[PDB]
Every structure is written in C-alpha cells, then in structure tokens.
Amino acid sequence: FHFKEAWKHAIQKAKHMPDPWAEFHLEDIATERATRHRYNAVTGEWLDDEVLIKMASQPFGRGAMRECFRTKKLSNFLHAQQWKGASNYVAKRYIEPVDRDVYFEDVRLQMEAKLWGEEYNRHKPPKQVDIMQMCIIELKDRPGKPLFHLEHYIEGKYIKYNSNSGFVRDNIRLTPQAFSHFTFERSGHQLIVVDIQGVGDLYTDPQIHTETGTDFGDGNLGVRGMALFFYSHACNRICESMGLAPFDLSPRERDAVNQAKTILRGTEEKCKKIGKSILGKVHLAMVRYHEGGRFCEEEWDQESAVFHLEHAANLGELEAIVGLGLMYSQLPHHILADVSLKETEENKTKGFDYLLKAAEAGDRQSMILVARAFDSGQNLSPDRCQDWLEALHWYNTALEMEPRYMMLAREAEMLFTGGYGLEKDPQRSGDLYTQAAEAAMEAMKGRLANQYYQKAEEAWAQ
C-alpha cells in the first residue's frame, strides 16, 4: 500500500469540495418514491429495490431524442445517508413517449457496451475507458407510472466524440475512435460500439450497431452503421498498436479522411469467414449510401462506389457479383443503375465470369442469362463457346429454382433438333413440351398450351 496516503488525501479533499449542484437546491424538492431496476450484463439478471429521489421539474440538457434532469437520490449502500450528503444523478427520459421495453433494452445496450470497455482496457491501452452504469427508476406514484433512466452525474465538459451516423469530432482524441474500431475487430465484425460521448473517457448513452440489426433499439443501423463509421475513420497509433486492420477505403475517401496528446506506452496488446462476409455487406452499404447522396461533399462519387462494389463482390456479396456481372456485360442493373462501364473484351470476360459465379451461387436471373449465353451466344464471353448441353443445365436449374413455359418449350426445341454439342432426344422433347403445355394452362394461356401439346405429339411422332 504505497498509495494509501494518496487515497486519504483525495478522500479529505472530497469531504471539503462543494456540491456543484448546490445552487439548484434540489434538497428542497418534494421527495418521491421509486422502484429501481439494476441490470447485470454477465448474468442477464435484474435486481429491484426501493429508492427515494428528488428530481428537478425541468430538464437541464437534451438531445434529439432524450432529455436530462438533475436528480438527487439516497444511497442504499450507505446505512444512514442524509439528503445533505446525497450524490448527484442524471435522470433521462425520451421526449416523445416510447414503449416501456425501450428503457429496459437501453440498459442492456449500455451495460453491454460497458463490458466492451472492460475488454478494451484488458488490452492495456494508453488511456482506459469506462461506460457509466445506467439503471431504471419507476415513479409508481406519478401519473402513468413513468420510467426514467438514472446514472451518476459526471462533472466536466460533455463532449460527443462520434455519433451513430458517421460524425467525428477538432482537437481530435484518439481513444474514443480506437475503442469503436476495437469493438469491430474484437467482435469479429459482429458489432461496433459508437456514439461515444461523455466527460473525458467516461462514456454514456453509446450505441451498438450489429450485423443483424435487431437488438439495442432503433439506433442500431446494422451494417449501414458500420459503413458510416469507417467512411470517416482515420486509424491512429492505438488502432495500429492493437493490430486493428484498416478499412479498405477509396483513394478519394482516404485523402478526405487524411485531410494528438495520447501517446503510446509500448505495452498495448494485439486484438474468419463470417467477418469477411460482414465486411462485404459493409462495402455494399457504402455503395448504396454513395448512390443515395449520404456522402455529399460535388456530384455523387461514382468511382468510389464502384471501388466498394468490387470489394463487396470479391468478399462474396451475391448482390455485388450480379451487379458487376451485368455492368461489365453492358446490361441493365439495379445497383449503380446510372453508372456504365467501358465496353472492352476484358470486361466482357469478367461480365460473364461474374454472372456464372452468381448463377452457381443461386441467383435465378444470372442462371437465365448464362443459359441464354450458352444457347444463343448472347452475352457469351468470347473465351467460351455455345454449348446447348450446358444451356440445358442452366435452364432447368432456373425452372427447378421469365415464364416457365417459355424456358420449358425452349428446352424441348433444342432437344427436338440438337446442335452445339447436344444430341437430339425426341422423347424428352415431347416430355418437356408436355410440361410446358401444363405450365401454360396454369398461366391461363390455354391456346399456347394446345400448341405445346401439338408440338409434343410431333416430337414423339419422330
């Protein structure tokens, strides 16, 4: 105990420090009874107890969704605390009414983010962090039995270092941004803790984006929320001290991002197919945001969007593989619709290869396009050849997955005559014409069905 005196000197200073909220005379407010609900994130269990509170009638601060009230509360850890010594607390409530469960899920959010702060601290960072415990008080005597969040008051300059929508703070501090990036890496890209705000490195009201995007309330923007973070994230020495992999940004994006007191200590420690798959979805989310104007600065950056569409396709995102296959094939496309790529023989090989990959991954649209390429040569790469057996393999795969009777009748046509490596099979041609006739009846194309039945008899008459 070479610091026991340092503890005492601080304890004595505190006994002589004045209450920063003395001027507000919260002790004069009529006392109110409340049930407090405190959460344990490791066990998932709740502990309830009865408390006495004195809450100001008017909020001293607010945001877009929540307002804060100055509050005093007696401790149930102390045995005989008088109101003259009550600690200072901040009570928070949603400005517009929300469902009661929101208050409980917000506590789960904050306490889960508190666990991630403890994980970050276990990697020996230059500056440690802590997320303030938040609980729920229930004012059962008030009209409607309203719920409030409650936490201890942290005196000092309240600063929002980042948001849940891409904002970054201008005397830039390294620790808040490194913590957020750490949670992305350490969780295997399954979550990120953002909206880092508070006093110093004591944080409150954080937000978690998850891969599913189903928990932690409406602030969970999913992989879109991770994209907003990494669009403006400049990795710092803490990010690299812990071996956090940088996000692959475009040349224009990296320069705009590249367009500090916290120093390393040499003790920082270092922090899967699922993550690379989530990483692909984060890249695809950047594409949609570029197209949607979220990254406005001139005109929407088409080159950076394509940069992220290729990274998404290379990471396995089927929507990106289909999109690039159509774009390199000079075909209409949904993603980056107004963007066109230069027609070149190299790209026409890439276009078909992407469409073939997408076909082999289950995309019905690519399977019909690949079938037609092997059938008629349309959109077929010049490295390949018309192959009617291969075309059969992709028509029927689409049928077993536009009109089905059209593809069934086409298969029968090819088998009635043969060609391009496919040997004729009249019996199968009549069978497929029969399936097409039945498919035409289910589509109310009765006259077309009679034609298919007649073509079936002719194929069998051979």
Partner 1 sequence: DSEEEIREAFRVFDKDGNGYISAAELRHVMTNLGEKLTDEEVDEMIREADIDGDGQVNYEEFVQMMTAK
Ligand X SMILES: Nc1ncnc2c1ncn2[C@@H]1O[C@H](COP(=O)(O)OP(=O)(O)O)[C@@H](O)[C@H]1O
Known binding residues for ATP are: 217-223
Task: Give me the least distance between CB of 209 and Zn ion, in Å please.
Answer: 15
* Residue span binding partner 1 (CB under 8 A) among the ranges 70-78, 157-165, 422-430, 445-453: 70-78
128 lies in the binding site for partner 1 (CB under 8 A)? yes
461 lies in the binding site for partner 1 (CB under 8 A)? no
239 lies in the binding site for Zn ion (CB under 5 A)? yes
151 lies in the binding site for ligand EKI (CB under 6 A)? yes
Residue 66 interacting partner from ligand EKI, partner 1, Zn ion, none (CB closer than 5 to 8 Å by kind): ligand EKI
Q: Which of 153, 300, 420, 460 binds ligand EKI (CB under 6 A)?
A: 153
Strand order in the sheet with 130-131: 130-131, 202-203, 197-199, 158-160
Return the residue matching tokens 């043969």: 418
Binding mask of the shown chain, residues 181 to 210, with x at each position contacting ligand EKI by CB under 6 A: -----------------------xx-----
277 lies in the binding site for partner 1 (CB under 8 A)? no
Q: Give the binding-site size for ligand X (rule: CB under 6 A).
A: 9
Task: Give me the least distance between CB of 171 and partner 1, in Å please.
Answer: 17
Q: Are 265 and 241 a contacting pair, CB within 8 Å?
A: no
21/416 with CB nearer ligand EKI: 21
d(CA 322, CA 7): 64
Task: Give me the least distance between CB of 4 and partner 1, in Å please.
Answer: 6
401 lies in the binding site for ligand X (CB under 6 A)? no
Residue 92 interacting partner from partner 1, ligand X, ligand EKI, none (CB closer than 5 to 8 Å by kind): ligand EKI
196/358 with CB nearer ligand EKI: 196
Task: Give me the least distance between CB of 10 and ligand X, in Å please.
Answer: 18
Question: Quick one: which of 6, 277, 220 has its CA closest to 102?
Answer: 220
Task: Give me the least distance between CB of 39 and ligand X, in Å please.
Answer: 6
Task: Give me the least distance between CB of 234 and Zn ion, in Å please.
Answer: 7
235 lies in the binding site for Zn ion (CB under 5 A)? yes
150/367 with CB nearer ligand EKI: 150
Task: Give me the least distance between CB of 239 and Zn ion, in Å please.
Answer: 3
Please give the residues from 230 up to 269 whose contact with partner 1 meets the rule CB under 8 A.
none
Q: Which of 33, 98, 121, 376 binds partner 1 (CB under 8 A)?
A: 121
* Residue span binding partner 1 (CB under 8 A) among the ranges 51-59, 149-157, 227-235, 417-425: 149-157
Q: Which of 90, 223, 239, 278 binds ligand EKI (CB under 6 A)?
A: 90
Q: Are 52 and 78 a contacting pair, CB within 8 Å?
A: no
Task: Give me the least distance between CB of 181 and ligand EKI, in Å please.
Answer: 22
189 lies in the binding site for Zn ion (CB under 5 A)? no
Task: Give me the least distance between CB of 401 and partner 1, in Å please.
Answer: 54
33 lies in the binding site for ligand X (CB under 6 A)? no
115 lies in the binding site for ligand X (CB under 6 A)? no
Return the residue matching tokens 């690379």: 276
Question: Quick one: which of 424, 333, 406, 419 has its CA closest to 368?
Answer: 406
Please give the residues from 72 up to 101 whose contact with ligand X meets the rule CB under 6 A.
73, 75-77
Question: Quick one: which of 413, 412, 411, 403 has its CA closest to 440?
Answer: 403
Annotated binding residues = 217-223
Answer positive or negative: Cα dihedral of 48, 54, 58, 62: negative
**Footprint of partner 1 on this chain (CB under 8 A)?**
1-4, 6-7, 9-11, 13-14, 17, 75, 77-80, 85, 87, 114, 117-118, 121-122, 127-130, 132-133, 151-152, 154-156, 199-202
Residue numbers at the binding site for Zn ion (CB under 5 A): 181, 235, 239, 244
